[model samples]
Target: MPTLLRVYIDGPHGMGKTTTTQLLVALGSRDDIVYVPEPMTYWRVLGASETIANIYTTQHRLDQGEISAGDAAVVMTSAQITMGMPYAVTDAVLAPHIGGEAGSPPPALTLIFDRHPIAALLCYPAARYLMGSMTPQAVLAFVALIPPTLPGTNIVLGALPEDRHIDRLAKRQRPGERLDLAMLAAIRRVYGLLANTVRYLQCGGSWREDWGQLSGPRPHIGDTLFTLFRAPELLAPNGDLYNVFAWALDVLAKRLRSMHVFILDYDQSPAGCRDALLQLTSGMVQTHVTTPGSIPTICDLARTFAREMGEAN
Candidate 1:
């Protein structure tokens, strides 16, 4: 049989990763295929916004053998948020989905990250204020499945990006509170720093060549510019982005070298995401059931580059 796929949807906030995954679930469930939720929302009912990083840390532990499955598990998360976990506020509640009968063996796990494989998912008010990723209810559905994260041997579908996600954020700003011209400028700087981080994780690979170069702001208010340093974490005190991803890429490469990864382009998926509201839900399910649990995750991260290249003209 062909291998099941594991995919991660790494991109800027609102670039439609979650939307696409949601579409996948709809299609998978409709077709009786497999589906799973991200980590944050899965864990949220247990705490709230306060449980942030704690939940992500817990998931990592669960993934490793450091912790045992007390019950089932489910989780949903974003890859933004600096001071807190890089995921969402709803991961904790999803824990029960991976567990089993009080003493039964733990259930296998499937994790999805709308903004993972890169830090671009970590920026903006979308994560900090908008609840921009998956909704809480979505996490609730998967948590009911079984005792997830219970066993160490399961499937994992991860996705990485070759294009920078920050570019997407630079172009999406609505008028009003905090989404002003200055924020637009900030986003530009943010993407520059973020792009470097992407390259770092890629081990100096020029994966992120495009992100936000789409049509001029439609209804939003902000300037989309690229830069070297306006954010501290990605940039050094003197300027240049810190290149944290470079070391991280090396580490991940060394550890997961045996895994096979694939690259996804926007042109490869169903119709372009212009129909995100309807298409994304099924997109997630198709990706999960069709791909393997290890190696390259499912994603259209190249859209970031495509959008930029298309707009440059």
Candidate 2:
């Protein structure tokens, strides 16, 4: 088996993750590459009791340390813990899905996941906000519980351009699927906070009273999390930043030295994520904003990725 290269294309909803991954799949069809679509959506659309059973059974294997993230994910997706379930349920079942301990690594091949655990964790609270369900305080409480990245993993964050307004498509959205404009805005704000927090942790910044700031208008979720930072101990148990948010960014920082970390912010929006990537990666992964004609088509990027993977092999 070839070495497994795990690449995650992650961002907010409607940020072209699905489209980009599809293109890559098409291009790499002949290569030993596996494309795992968003698992929860696949199961939810099927909407069978057995589907839920599969999730529970797979999650059990995860908790028992009997499977790798890739293997456990072969049947069910990670985002199920965050989607459609209530906040309490989401919080209850989230940790196991995000494995913090390294088990036996799966066989090698290029593995592309539509989204990863970190993105899902941050987006879970936003989903609650869009539905007017969970409070900001409660959201932060849940965020605090999210364990850090597990061992032997590298992460690539595919951020959408900051100004990409998803609300424009709400009118044509399916029934019961229209995203609230305010909620999308709030989610973008939270992504900024997440990026900044990760940047601070990578810089050896303490989990102290004065660490960072959220530049955008205070969203309902941001307000509570911002205040929680005043007593930083509340955010990370035992005052260890690594166990909270630091480990993921710090790991990404370390990985940049040995590998290329791609951030697909083609429109150059979301400057916060770009800055965080730059600062943490130490100029290794610079933000690339594609201009009108300069933008590479999905097929183009896919073909390039396939060729590169072949050369590396």
Candidate 3:
């Protein structure tokens, strides 16, 4: 069976994720490797235009009392769906070609993705929940939509100092976006917690058995992603998670536990960041393709996605 390696670079925005990954893919084998860029074109024009703008604007309006929380939730939730549709569609199309995970060797092909679907489905929504722009129920709904972890899903998350991150964010704002330091802090905290969540599981943590610890001072609950969902909305009268919210956490655990995670230090030059990411790829798991055509087929899929859903021109 031909083998394929899929690496998804994800973290809070403005940590130079797009810049570093673009450089890495540009320097790889065009036939044997492909870059699936963020569907910025789709987010900006196709599926919906100015989605990022609308999200920020809605939050700002809500903050300024120009809109109600209900109004903000509706806008944020729908915009998130729009934000994630291209990722969902892309992953759905690629699933069948993939099989079980294999050993740590570079294979016939590698597909580098700008971000995984979970950045939109789980992480960002969780951040928005922390921001009060999205309801806890709505955040849980997006968590439920997280696709099953495909074999060889290697997610490279970024780590940057908050001061540097804030500076970079200021320079990276797109059109119509107002600077939001609170949103920035929330996203940073969420991504940091995600990296910790993977480590917590790798070290023998289990949400199924330890979920009751959420209401306690247990370090285990503090270290994992469960701490973020301790909101009154998702809790029972006794402070334990409601059954449905626990189910959503179960899905989050299931999806995150199987995937390999690597942290790239984005506290360097773009080229330095790219090289650091490349080094981590050696330790990542890959999968055997079920079909001989899966290599070029996947490559074409990347190109087609880029052509159709690329950044705004």
Candidate 4:
């Protein structure tokens, strides 16, 4: 049986976590490897707003004043942490479970996850506040109420630089999506705190598997590669730093074949990391984008896909 390695790709927003996860899916195309993209990707594929409404019907019920807002907030926050995240994780785990007509057992393989439930737990505060159900203090308290759900044997963080990170946040806005410098700084500070919290939890004895719903089994430490890419960008100096300082020392030297952490640079040019991915794959890489702020690239990718499909057909 193949080793059931659980790998988590995590980091703050605009940190290339998704990009690196996609890279792994492309590079590791073995039939046994199971790649679970971000849970939000599945939501988008099945109509996000509809899924949100369906999963959290309490939002609308409370909004209509049929239920108490405070009570609904507490219940919904718990559901988001326990129910919503579990739904996604369970679906990912069961997607490839079915075997033949005789109902054969599921095969074991490396499970690659892009921001699992633990990562989603960090967003509980924001989700509750946006749902208009929790006060700021209540949100923080509710956040603290979340249990430590360990989601992986190895965690890879794609840490981004402050300047470029802020630049991405500033320019990447949409209708009603506004964040002042103060707010951005606040967000950055929150991420820093959260990252440090994770580090502390891992380094100290405070982190416990008993708190997690799916923390029963851990991959052998010898078979795992947990890395945090601390480079500023994906350009020459920064890229070299990742290749040498982190990737080489941690990944290559460890002889880990199934894990990596990529901290992409904030460059939308044709010479960016995506193009570099095509080069790595010899111009035969499939591209995907889940969230917003990638509409331009998505459009261009769509056109390119059309041309390629047309030529192939």
Candidate 5:
């Protein structure tokens, strides 16, 4: 059987994630590995043109007293759904081809993703909820839909100081973009919580209520991703989570628990970060496919997503 290496480099925005991702791809042989970039083009026009701007703009209007919270939530919720489609569909399409873990080096194909689906499905939405741009129920609904983690899901999250990140954001501002420090801060916190949540789950931390009910065991609150969604809107009369939202939390935990996470220092140069990332991959997982044809097929799959979903590189 052939094996595959899947890695996702994800963290806060403006961390030079795209630049590093490209350099990592450039460092590897062209035939065996493929890079799936962030779906900025898909976000820009395929799904609905101007979605990124719409989202940032909506939040801006809300902060400036021009729009109501409900209006902002509605717009944010729809735009968020549009944002995640490329990721969700790509994962779903690739899901069946991925088989059991191989636990070895240099698989037949290596697929590097710019971000996991959770960046849209879980992390960003959670941040927007914290910023009051999204409703708790909407966040839970998005969380509930996070794809189950595939066996070789290795995620590389970023590390950079806030001051450095802000400077980068200002310099790399995109079309229709406006700087929002509050959005930056909120997104940063959610990613940190995500890393903590993964560690908490991997190190035997767990939910208290039964598998079906989810949440509680108050100590998990501060340490887990569950902490972000404790909004009053989700509570029952007794202050317990309503079963529906609790089920979403259960899904959240299940999706996060299986991911193999690594930390990448984006504070370094692009080439330095690329090599550091290569070094960090030593501890990651890989998986074997049942057929030899799966290798080329998988390469095709990865490259196709890169072509269809990528922006002007």
Candidate 6:
């Protein structure tokens, strides 16, 4: 079987988590890897509020032991951890197997998604937060430190946020759509973790994944609930850290055929093509804060991915 590494990245509401996740889908090449669209994406595909209704109904059935656990499987999570729906469904799928009790055994492996790193830099002055940068510069500086021979290792670059501009993000209005106060907390928490050496050590040397979600617990670590701010502005174009990071991703992607690279836009959630879907999936507009029980294993995957890319190029 293809080795699948589940990881989660989390942070504030508008930190670009969801956008990064969606980009991972587009970033894949051939069938070697693929991104599971977030459940809300399914709502857009199915086109009906009933989609959420059915999901909840199914979840209720599963909770009652009326259905199979496999049915609740989450195909993908939006980069926005604050929304709650992603994990609500994630928990539902894992619920059947989590020892039949609250806070039981989780799957052998599961991935999370988040954007806390960006939040840490922007919210706090603890350092590593570039006042007005969202480009791949930070990530690039980090990457430059890695010796090319290291190949499979990850190069954590704190780049400028993507530059994709949407009027809605700039405004941050609409219930479940706004991104404000809750986001501030997420960012602060991120700074606390990233600024400290211990958090990075817990990360296992991979700068982003240590506190990020994919490899972590619910809400991934820095992620929280709700927000009061308006929607978010674009960070990097295509919601990525821009071509610099994209170039690195492309290089790494060409190498490791066995690993999957999950990008959580980690910025504010992306507005889907349909406005209703954005509204229906609006719970993210409000907020709270929490840390993940664990962290993502992206470092291991990155090691292999980077190596493979180097060899190929």
Question: Which candidate number would show the highest lDDT if scored against the true structure?
Answer: 3
Per-residue lDDT over 214-267 for candidate 2, one digit per residue giving the tens place of the 0 to 100 score: 222222323332432333433455544434444433343342223223455534
Q: Report, for every candidate in turn, its global Cα lDDT versus the true structure.
A: 0.31, 0.42, 0.85, 0.41, 0.84, 0.29
Which residue runs does candidate 5 get wrong by more than 4 Å?
Answer: 209-220
- lDDT string, candidate 6, 151-257, tens digits: 11111212124333233245433222333333344344443343332232333333233322322222223332101110122134443234444354333222222
User: Candidate 4, residues 61-131: lDDT per residue as tens digits?
Assistant: 67679888777767656555542454344434332431212111232344555554434454444444545
1-313, model 3: which lDDT tens digit per residue?
7789999988998899888877887785557777787887788788887888889999999999999888888999999999999899889989999999888854788888989999999888888888888998998898888888899899999899989999999998876678899999988888878888888887778876776666562237577677888888877897677899988888888888887888899999999998898888888888998889988888899889988887631
Q: Which ten residues in a row have the lowest lDDT in candidate 4?
A: 222-231
- Residue 44 CA displacement from its true place in model 2, Å: 2.8
Model 2 segments more than 4 A misplaced: 40-108, 126-132, 144-148, 159-163, 167-175, 209-262, 268-313
User: TM-score for every candidate vs. truth?
Assistant: 0.32, 0.50, 0.95, 0.43, 0.94, 0.28
Candidates sorted on lDDT, descending: 3, 5, 2, 4, 1, 6
What TM-score, to 2 decimals, does candidate 2 have? 0.50
Which sequence of candidate numbers ranks them by TM-score, best first? 3, 5, 2, 4, 1, 6
Worst 10 residues of 3 by lDDT: 212-221
Error of 6 at 175 (Å): 4.7
The whole-model C-alpha lDDT of candidate 4 against the native structure comes to: 0.41
Model 1 earns a TM-score of 0.32
Q: Write the per-residue lDDT of candidate 5 for residues 1-313, one digit (tens) a residue.
A: 6778889989998998888878877864767768888888888989998999999999999999999999999999999999999989988978878899888466778888888899989899999999999998999898888888889899999999999899999999876678999989999989988888888787777664432233432334475677766777887888778899978888888888999888899888988988888888777898987576777777888778778777754
lDDT of 1 by residue, 82-159 (tens): 212323222233222222222112112234334332232223321221221222222222222212222211212222
Candidate 1 deviant stretches above 4 angstroms: 28-112, 117-271, 274-313
Q: Is candidate 5 or candidate 6 better by lDDT?
A: 5
Clashing pairs in 3: none
